[PDB]
Specification:
part of a larger assembly, 2 chains, A: mainly beta, Immunoglobulin-like, 2 domains, 5-stranded antiparallel beta sheet, 0% helix, B: mainly beta, 5-stranded mixed beta sheet, 4-stranded antiparallel beta sheet, 2 helices, 17 strands, elongated, binds a molecule of 3 linked components (NAG-NAG-BMA), transport protein, cys-loop ligand-gated pentameric ion channels, cation-selective channel
């Protein structure tokens, strides 16, 4: 069996988004479809369930009125309609099969990420950084590559064809006020940095933007 | 909605050790047919959850036998005999006895090992940042363990907190360490006026807080 979910979505606050979960390889009308929310912070929250064969639906107290479940029997698809949105609703939404009191929820959808933000698509603005002048130089030294003022996710940061991959730490993107950023620091031998060329690559599939800014000593 | 409380919030255990996770219910979740419908799910990072145990006495197919379950009317626990690298993730308890059905809080699982001291670094802004009209002050704390980390932004003898970004990285695999990258966005008018910036951090390995600073005036 297989549960296929719709693609990623971006919506402005106050709008409504409808996402779908399509099931195949089993009797679609005879299984409940469970909708689960996972905010980036933590936790799995169950929104509710719908039985496509009938129109029966259940909602958790928190999401009553927020979500509306509908199902199409002709096409093995079920939908969840999210009402007026906010920044809080940004999360990854999952669909899963379920038959209460018997074999339970062994197949899940891949997940569908929903992002609520007033921002528009922005290209990455990578500003490579180098060690400060007022700092001692030793054998072990870190490197720096900063990407900021970009939207939406994801943006992949990697060195020149993986010139030096191990020893890097790409930190999760965060919003300063409205746009995402990213920090990636790696370590290289002091005797090799001024000799070997090391640079960070930036890719933005949504914006089709590729950047390559080498870092040189201050 | 039946509230399910899961403890501990985190569980560090070295490889091969016994792991115990407990899930408690706000009400009795027994069912008339002699079964109690409690299920345990594992969600490794970047993936949809998976089914491990249902009807705790029972166990799903295709799962290692080291997992086991037990409990009674309102208290249940899950046990992992021998821990392995693939067993890292977040474990949730799910009750399927009273409508609506609710997930557990979640019990993240880590692996404990010989802790390591932090390696701090500071990167002042770059030429591009200066030209743009800003100043990106980033202090990097790579390969440190455990989470007992607190970073204070002290500058020229004054502690600044506004504009302080907090974003760490999940536990690694090769090093099983943690990394911290906190950033302080500064403007040209404000960046130059300060003379000295310090990156202040504390950790359990070294009771005396560590210090790292540089002077703009050079
Ligand atoms: C609805 O009523 C039916 C009929 O009584 C119930 O079916 C019975 O369910 C029990 C509990 O699962 C079965 O006993 C179990 O059998 C398994 C497999 O043999 C065994 O490993 C367990 O230790 C336990 O003995 C029983 O076989 C089954 N009877 C029949 C005829 O299928 C059903 O549970 C009821 N469902 C609900 C929601 O009330």
């Amino acid at each position: 069996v297989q549960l296929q979910q719709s693609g990623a979505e971006v919506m402005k606050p106050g709008a409504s988004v409808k996402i779908s979960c399509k099931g195949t390889g089993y009797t679609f009308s005879s299984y409940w479809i469970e909708w689960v929310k996972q905010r980036p912070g933590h936790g799995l929250e169950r929104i509710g369930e719908i039985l496509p064969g009938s129109g029966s639906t259940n909602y958790n107290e928190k999401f009553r009125g927020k979500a509306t479940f509908t199902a199409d029997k002709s096409s093995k698809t079920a939908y969840m309609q999210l009402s007026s949105l906010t920044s809080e609703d940004s999360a990854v939404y999952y669909c899963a099969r379920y038959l209460p009191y018997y074999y339970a929820m062994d197949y899940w959808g891949q997940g569908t990420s929903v992002t609520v933000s007033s921002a528009k698509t922005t290209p990455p603005s990578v500003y490579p950084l180098a060690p400060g002048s007022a700092a001692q130089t030793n054998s072990m030294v870190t490197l720096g590559c900063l990407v900021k003022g970009y939207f939406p996710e994801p943006v992949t940061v990697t060195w020149n064809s993986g010139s030096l991959s191990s020893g890097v730490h790409t930190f999760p993107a965060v919003l300063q006020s409205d746009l995402y950023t990213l920090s990636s620091s790696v370590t290289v031998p002091s005797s090799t940095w001024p000799s070997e060329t090391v640079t960070c690559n930036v890719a933005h599939p949504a914006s089709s933007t590729k950047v390559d800014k080498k870092i040189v000593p201050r | 909605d039946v509230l399910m409380t899961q403890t501990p919030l985190s569980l560090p255990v070295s490889l091969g050790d016994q792991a115990s996770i407990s899930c408690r219910s706000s009400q009795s979740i027994v069912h008339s047919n002699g079964n109690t419908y409690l299920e345990w799910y594992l969600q490794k990072p970047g993936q949809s959850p998976k089914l491990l145990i249902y009807k705790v006495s029972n166990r799903f197919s295709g799962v290692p036998d080291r997992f086991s379950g037990s409990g009674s009317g309102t208290d249940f626990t899950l046990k992992i005999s021998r821990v392995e690298a693939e067993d890292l993730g977040v474990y949730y308890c799910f009750q399927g006895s009273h409508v609506p059905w609710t997930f557990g809080g979640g019990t993240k699982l880590e692996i404990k090992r010989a802790d390591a001291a932090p390696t701090v670094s500071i990167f002042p802004p770059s030429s591009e940042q200066l030209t743009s009209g800003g100043a990106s002050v980033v202090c990097f704390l790579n390969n440190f363990y455990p989470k007992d980390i607190n970073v204070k932004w002290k500058i020229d003898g004054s502690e600044r907190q506004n504009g302080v970004l907090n974003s760490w990285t999940d536990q690694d695999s090769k090093d099983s360490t943690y990394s911290m990258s906190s950033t302080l966005t500064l403007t040209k008018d404000e960046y130059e006026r300060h003379n000295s910036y310090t990156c202040e951090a504390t950790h359990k390995t070294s009771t005396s807080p560590i210090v790292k600073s540089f002077n703009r005036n050079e």
